[PDB]
Design an enzyme around this catalytic site. Sequence first.
Site, mmCIF file in Angstrom:
data_model
loop_
_atom_site.group_PDB
_atom_site.id
_atom_site.type_symbol
_atom_site.label_atom_id
_atom_site.label_comp_id
_atom_site.label_asym_id
_atom_site.label_seq_id
_atom_site.Cartn_x
_atom_site.Cartn_y
_atom_site.Cartn_z
ATOM 1 N N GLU A 151 0.827 -1.201 0.000
ATOM 2 C CA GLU A 151 0.000 0.000 0.000
ATOM 3 C C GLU A 151 0.865 1.258 0.000
ATOM 4 O O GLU A 151 0.573 2.216 -0.723
ATOM 5 C CB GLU A 151 -0.960 0.004 1.195
ATOM 6 C CG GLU A 151 -1.963 1.164 1.140
ATOM 7 C CD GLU A 151 -2.673 1.446 2.466
ATOM 8 O OE1 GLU A 151 -2.006 1.514 3.521
ATOM 9 O OE2 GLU A 151 -3.904 1.650 2.433
ATOM 10 N N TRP A 179 -8.166 -2.622 -0.522
ATOM 11 C CA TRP A 179 -8.981 -1.551 -1.082
ATOM 12 C C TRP A 179 -10.073 -2.043 -2.023
ATOM 13 O O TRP A 179 -10.809 -1.211 -2.566
ATOM 14 C CB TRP A 179 -8.100 -0.532 -1.814
ATOM 15 C CG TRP A 179 -7.392 0.416 -0.906
ATOM 16 C CD1 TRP A 179 -6.148 0.256 -0.361
ATOM 17 C CD2 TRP A 179 -7.883 1.682 -0.431
ATOM 18 N NE1 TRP A 179 -5.832 1.351 0.418
ATOM 19 C CE2 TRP A 179 -6.881 2.235 0.396
ATOM 20 C CE3 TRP A 179 -9.073 2.398 -0.623
ATOM 21 C CZ2 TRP A 179 -7.026 3.480 1.024
ATOM 22 C CZ3 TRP A 179 -9.215 3.646 0.007
ATOM 23 C CH2 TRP A 179 -8.199 4.164 0.819
ATOM 24 N N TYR A 220 -5.237 8.951 -1.558
ATOM 25 C CA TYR A 220 -3.888 9.261 -1.083
ATOM 26 C C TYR A 220 -2.839 9.428 -2.175
ATOM 27 O O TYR A 220 -2.195 10.471 -2.262
ATOM 28 C CB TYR A 220 -3.419 8.185 -0.105
ATOM 29 C CG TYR A 220 -4.256 8.085 1.147
ATOM 30 C CD1 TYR A 220 -4.182 9.073 2.125
ATOM 31 C CD2 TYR A 220 -5.104 7.002 1.356
ATOM 32 C CE1 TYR A 220 -4.926 8.988 3.266
ATOM 33 C CE2 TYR A 220 -5.857 6.898 2.509
ATOM 34 C CZ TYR A 220 -5.753 7.917 3.463
ATOM 35 O OH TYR A 220 -6.492 7.834 4.611
ATOM 36 N N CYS A 257 -8.751 9.129 5.844
ATOM 37 C CA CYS A 257 -8.691 8.957 7.286
ATOM 38 C C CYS A 257 -7.391 9.599 7.755
ATOM 39 C CB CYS A 257 -8.690 7.525 7.842
ATOM 40 S SG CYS A 257 -10.166 6.639 7.390
ATOM 41 N N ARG A 267 -8.061 11.418 11.457
ATOM 42 C CA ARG A 267 -9.343 11.980 11.876
ATOM 43 C C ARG A 267 -10.222 10.960 12.595
ATOM 44 O O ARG A 267 -11.069 11.341 13.418
ATOM 45 C CB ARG A 267 -10.068 12.562 10.656
ATOM 46 C CG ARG A 267 -10.547 11.507 9.675
ATOM 47 C CD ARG A 267 -11.500 12.073 8.614
ATOM 48 N NE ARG A 267 -11.777 11.072 7.588
ATOM 49 C CZ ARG A 267 -12.722 10.141 7.674
ATOM 50 N NH1 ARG A 267 -13.518 10.070 8.739
ATOM 51 N NH2 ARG A 267 -12.866 9.259 6.689
ATOM 52 N N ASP A 278 -10.344 3.035 14.183
ATOM 53 C CA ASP A 278 -10.733 1.828 14.895
ATOM 54 C C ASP A 278 -9.495 1.340 15.630
ATOM 55 O O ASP A 278 -8.557 0.830 15.005
ATOM 56 C CB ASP A 278 -11.254 0.783 13.910
ATOM 57 C CG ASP A 278 -11.755 -0.486 14.585
ATOM 58 O OD1 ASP A 278 -11.324 -0.829 15.714
ATOM 59 O OD2 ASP A 278 -12.592 -1.165 13.956
#
Lengths: 248, 248
Positions: free
Chosen positions: A55, A77, A91, A143, A163, A166
């Site tokens: 990633e 994804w 991103y 995120c 922001r 989990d």
Amino acid sequence: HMQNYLHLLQDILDNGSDKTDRTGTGTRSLFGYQLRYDLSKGFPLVTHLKSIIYELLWFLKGDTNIKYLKDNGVSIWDEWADENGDLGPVYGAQWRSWRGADNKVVDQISEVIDQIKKNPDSRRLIVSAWNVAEIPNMALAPCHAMFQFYVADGKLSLQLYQRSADVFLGVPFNIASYALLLMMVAQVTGLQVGDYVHSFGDVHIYNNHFEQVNRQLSRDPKPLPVMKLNPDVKDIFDFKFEDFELLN
Amino acid sequence: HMQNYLHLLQDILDNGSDKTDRTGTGTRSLFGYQLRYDLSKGFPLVTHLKSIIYELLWFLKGDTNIKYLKDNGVSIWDEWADENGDLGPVYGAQWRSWRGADNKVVDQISEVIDQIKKNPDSRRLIVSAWNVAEIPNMALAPCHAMFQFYVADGKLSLQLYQRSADVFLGVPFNIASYALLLMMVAQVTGLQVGDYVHSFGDVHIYNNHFEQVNRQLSRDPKPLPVMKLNPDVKDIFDFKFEDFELLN
């Protein structure tokens, strides 16, 4: 080791506020938190690494189509891509190709690395993914909203602003991802590794995971592993999967 | 009271790294820090308020020319404006009129307030000033890069990410500004006030201020004042200077 992460888990359990999604799924949450790791003391990851590495390589290529991930066996994804495998300008597109008015495009990764090298005392070594005008075109809102580097005494530090998190399922992956980015940038800028700092907005645990969290809280902590990068890589865009080895 | 702010001052003095600007001006700095204040326990400001209030009203108008400030006796931005009084698309322009590609403009203040009211559990109640493609047009890069709201148990919280801070001279003003914004937004969204959270990248004290800092560290702490807003204001754009009173 990562007792600070365990303290965050316990804080949410003890003091978090309960909420319910439209689908009836409950969470317990706090707002505002900060973790930090001295990366010279080990890599902050307990036990997967293949998805983390690919990633990051994908991000650094500027790619927002999932084909590269799927061709390397990485499916994290898949659920968000359209029928062509596209995610919109998430991103990778903001890191390498932030799009603004008047055909302005900014390669933020290249800019920030050049500034670490040439202006290490800069107080604005920032990459942002929160491209307000482009968020509606993204499969989901970022995120990991922005991050900032810092240089002192020959050591490079990185701080992430996340922001929403989990803490049980996502945060271990999130920490490892940006700590690894710090190690990669430190290497190609010729600096020693400093602190990774992780700041949070919303932090939550799903009520259905309370049993699993309590069990991890009572587990004996193990030493941190060591992340070793191929010392021959001198360009942030020249890393490959085999350049990473997690030891011990 | 604000012992956490005093602890930050002492931490930089004891453990910060020394640096020197091109002009020979020395600073001592740390990277990564977080403060928080429960705003129901008082307003986090020691002792000026007129500049704080007018600057916030100016931001909320979307104005980036200093004429409004100068006409209200506020000179804090004078040094950065051009000969016409312009600063380029700094805070007010990003808050009310973030400019992107394809003539996209976003009123982030109106959007986020609508979402606090209609979707309080949102995990992306964010305003950003870090408009990458527009920063070269700004008189200086935003120190207050982005902020995020949060709602739990009928209380509204706000977190600021500040990339760089003069802890002695600037941070008292910075804290008061965004804590006051939280109180204003809480009022017009019908919520009680929660926590103000202030996250920092670079935090520094100028070496020339060490004596002054040590003296403030040894001062007896006083109770926090109370900030009272005109309860008749129901629209974030309808505040006026006389709607604010700091007491005790």
